[PDB]
Design a protein around this ligand. Structure first.
Ligand SMILES: *[C@@H]1O[C@H](CO)[C@@H](O)[C@H](O)[C@H]1NC(C)=O
Lengths: 53, 108, 172, 172, 173
């Protein structure tokens, strides 16, 4: 019957999970991966300069 | 294309003196802190030969060859000039395809 | 969480609000979502500085070096290995723990920003509105779009609506 | 504490409630203690995971190894000793500090669970009860045992008692 | 901050209160003035002081570098020794820097929490005998003389004593 205003927070279709001390696998709206896990499996030149024996 | 222009075109220098051949790049050839310039020597009647890599370090090459320079302009310094130095000298950059060479400088 | 807002007295987030993390209406002119730019930017700055601080604190981390030893240097070989693994294990703990600890604080940080936003509105409205108890305040007066905007930017003129609010409270 | 509940606005715990950490009544049918199973189990899970996480994070800790050296190996002997003590001191700090830090958070965690429980009831009762200000709400209506149970399991029907509450407020 | 008080619903501190961190400003007929809540202030002082002393205490078993010499054919253990020393120096520098950063953040929020608790201490006493202005101030629905002000400040407010004169003043409003 009356005008109203609501306070609320964001949500989305994210499936990204994150861990904490008290809880594991916490789905979260946004997360940043900070661990690199891939390499090119090759020995390469370093900044335009290796001696391969 | 990084146009490489050598100067002078032909250089006649007295025996036992100093030859000073220059190279000039249209844009820089110089990132990662190193210069990606190379000097090549073509003694007449045979294939070119590698003298200097990344603008300063000698490849069995006598010390008479001074590789110097940074950025847009470089210089191959031959001093003292010996007898078996008649050749045409080339600078070529590797900083960015397509690999481009200089006009070349003939030494007398 | 720690502050009772996110998944607390406000039971659920809004897929509908998309221009921010925290925000707000429903009147005669119509309804719609809007993000509180101020509290959102504060949180963004806080989390961004946090992420950048974590990555910064780790620049002086241990870096393993190849070292070789012969058959009669087995002791210092092993010492060297224990030293390397030793630091690798310490710094792995430090990175893992730091992330776990600051994650927990981050979730509670958002919870706190929300609870503060709710309180920001509540402390403005006072008896000029009714606490529904779900993050919503039902007004005791007419709140047009411009009035909605005053609540959202902290310029609510409480006494302007005080009388029409008080009268509406008392027939109730 | 951090949240003002434990040893705060609720000045003291109850020896009488024994089936849980947090909980609740006094009506005509009689009085008694009861634990909030939900908030208690949440805390138990949280603290248990915390304890298990602390013990888990320490599995890659340093392990000292016996190593022998002769009279002309005093330098690497000493290096080896400094290395061992070095890691032993680091990991002792890490265990001591972790325990100190998480203890502090644990006490405040309980404080927060309590303050949330109080708010859970408060946000349900609204004007249907009076905040005594000591963790107790005095009802403005009749709350039988089944009504007490609805407050405890979050199913309080506010409007059902709204009228008899409002009438009792106004003769006051 | 975390608790919404300092630089929150109480927008600003008082240059005027100087005998403590947290306290009251009253205003009645007898006159106005600042006063520190001695109890909550002393608690905070004790907490912060123990915190500072605990940080300095936890660091007594820190690494201490020792001069060691090596010759030209001991370059490996020289380097090992250097890596070991820098290794611990870097760890303990991280530990000191991080500990200070983390406990600083908790300290600021600790003060925020002490304030929010102080406000709640008064609020829970006054109840409907006063109006929440929403800025850290409560406007009374009755007469509060200096002795009454002192009862609010030391947690001995007699709510029912003023209950009737408060209720009457609420209802002509
Ligand atoms: C977390 O989720 C992953 C897979 O998405 C799985 O490896 C694991 O069982 C989960 N553990 C917990 C405790 O939720």
């Amino acid at each position: 019957p009356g005008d109203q205003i609501c306070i609320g927070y964001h949500a989305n279709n994210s499936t990204e999970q994150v861990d904490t001390i008290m809880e594991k696998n916490v789905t979260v709206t946004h997360a940043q991966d900070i661990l690199e896990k891939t390499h090119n499996g090759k020995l390469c030149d370093l900044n335009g300069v290796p001696l391969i024996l | 294309d990084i146009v490489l222009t050598q100067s002078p075109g032909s250089l006649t220098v007295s025996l036992g003196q100093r030859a000073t051949i220059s190279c000039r790049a249209s844009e820089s050839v110089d990132n990662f802190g190193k210069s990606f310039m190379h000097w090549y020597q073509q003694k007449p009647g045979q294939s070119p030969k590698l003298l200097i890599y990344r603008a300063s370090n000698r490849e069995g090459i006598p010390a008479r060859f001074n590789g110097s320079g940074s950025g847009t302009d470089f210089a191959l310094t031959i001093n003292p000039v010996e007898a078996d130095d008649v050749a045409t000298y080339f600078c070529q950059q590797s900083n960015e395809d397509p690999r481009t060479f200089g006009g070349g400088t003939k030494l007398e | 969480g720690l502050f009772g807002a996110i998944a607390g007295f406000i039971e659920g987030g809004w897929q509908g609000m998309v221009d921010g993390w925290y925000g707000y209406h429903s009147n005669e002119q119509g309804s719609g979502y809007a993000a509180d730019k101020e509290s959102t930017q504060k949180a963004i700055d806080g989390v961004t500085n946090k992420v950048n601080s974590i990555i910064d604190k780790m620049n002086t981390q241990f870096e393993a070096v190849g070292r070789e030893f012969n058959n009669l240097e087995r002791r210092i070989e092993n010492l060297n290995k224990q030293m390397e693994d030793g630091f690798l294990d310490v710094w792995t703990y430090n990175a893992e723990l730091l992330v776990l600890m600051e994650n927990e604080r981050t979730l509670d940080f958002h919870d706190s920003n929300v609870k503060n936003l709710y309180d920001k509105v509540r402390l403005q409205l006072r008896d000029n509105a009714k606490e529904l108890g779900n993050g919503c305040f039902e007004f005791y007066h007419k709140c047009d779009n411009e009035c909605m905007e005053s609540v959202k930017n902290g310029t609510y003129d409480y006494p302007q609506y005080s009388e029409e609010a008080r009268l509406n409270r008392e027939e109730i």
